[PDB]
Design an enzyme around this catalytic site. Structure first.
Site, PDB file in Angstrom:
ATOM      1  CB  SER A 258       9.983 -36.418  -5.582  1.00  0.00           C
ATOM      2  OG  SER A 258      10.170 -37.757  -5.854  1.00  0.00           O
TER       3      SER A 258
ATOM      4  CE  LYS B  60       6.112 -44.438  -9.158  1.00  0.00           C
ATOM      5  NZ  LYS B  60       7.043 -43.585  -8.414  1.00  0.00           N
TER       6      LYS B  60
ATOM      7  CD  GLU C 149       6.929 -42.877 -12.780  1.00  0.00           C
ATOM      8  OE1 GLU C 149       6.279 -42.640 -12.172  1.00  0.00           O
ATOM      9  OE2 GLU C 149       8.012 -41.987 -13.116  1.00  0.00           O
TER      10      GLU C 149
ATOM     11  CB  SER D  59       8.105 -43.931  -5.086  1.00  0.00           C
ATOM     12  OG  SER D  59       7.472 -43.109  -5.873  1.00  0.00           O
TER      13      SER D  59
ATOM     14  CB  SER E 113       5.678 -40.663  -7.270  1.00  0.00           C
ATOM     15  OG  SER E 113       6.722 -41.283  -8.174  1.00  0.00           O
TER      16      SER E 113
END
EC number: 3.5.2.6
Length: 263
Positions: free
Chosen positions: A212, A48, A141, A105, A45
């Site tokens: 994570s 991002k 994702e 996230s 993440s």
């Protein structure tokens, strides 16, 4: 001394089970401390940040881009989308998707940002255009969190991401209003209280993005404004050999403690 910090990081890494990457930049004198600084780590993440910054770049020349509504379709929902699920069959703005990806996230919002940039390769291309030659985004994702050892997909090095994080928040990679917006979003993160932040005194300001994923991968990239000195950029990557390993956000706090105390 940088070297004292190294010994303490190495000792931390042995007790961790896993593999630690660190990269600090101190903008008071542009000194760098590195632990496994040129080793690749799954980004998860923390990636991002780049997606959101790339879209911000797009907005430098498409003025109203961030206020335009983007459709949230059922096919768009992925596991762990706390913000966007509340908008299925509705709309969000690329600003709201940016904030959701950065401060919660949200994976559906991340996929919307990736889609707005023309896919994984579109995020990578933006990295290249700001001089980040190491970042690579290869999947959407949530499959980009698989964090499989030895898979270079969706990885970077601590050195590269600290250099880039400085470029985006304290340098000139983005325009002035976009850079301020990015820093406002990172300062408003909700998911990093137990990572770098927990290793720093509470009077310091922190903009951060956690990551994570699989193999107990626990990451944080932060911009830190201490009292009484120039800001710092700290990247902390951590992954483990077992696929179902538990997250270790306290290890990242420890890494940040080691850094705040010794540098």
């Amino acid at each position: 001394q940088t070297s004292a910090v190294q010994q303490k990081l190495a000792a931390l890494e042995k007790s961790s089970g896993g593999r630690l990457g660190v990269a600090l930049i101190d903008t008071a004198d542009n000194t760098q401390v590195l632990y496994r600084g040129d080793e690749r780590f799954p980004m998860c993440s923390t990636s991002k940040v780049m997606a959101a910054a790339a879209v911000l770049k797009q907005s430098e020349t498409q003025k109203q881009l961030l206020n335009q509504p983007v459709e949230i379709k059922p096919a768009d929902l992925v596991n762990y989308n706390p913000i966007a699920e509340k908008h299925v069959n509705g709309t969000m703005t690329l600003a709201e998707l940016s904030a959701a990806a950065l401060q919660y996230s949200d994976n559906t919002a991340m996929n919307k940002l990736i889609a707005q940039l023309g896919g994984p390769g579109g995020v990578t291309a933006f990295a290249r255009a700001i001089g980040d030659e190491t970042f690579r985004l290869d999947r959407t994702e949530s499959t980009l969190n698989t964090a499989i050892p030895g898979d270079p997909r969706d990885t970077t090095t601590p050195r590269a991401m600290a250099q880039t994080l400085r470029q985006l928040t304290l340098g000139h990679a983005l325009g002035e209003t976009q850079r301020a917006q990015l820093v406002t979003w990172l300062k408003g993160n909700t998911t990093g209280a137990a990572s770098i932040r927990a290793g720093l005194p509470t009077s310091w300001t922190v903009g951060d993005k956690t990551g994570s994923g699989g193999y107990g991968t626990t990451n944080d990239i932060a911009v830190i404004w201490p009292q009484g000195r120039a800001p710092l950029v700290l990247v902390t990557y951590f992954t483990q050999p077992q696929q179902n390993a538990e997250s270790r956000r306290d290890v990242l706090a420890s890494a940040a403690r080691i850094i705040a105390e010794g540098l």
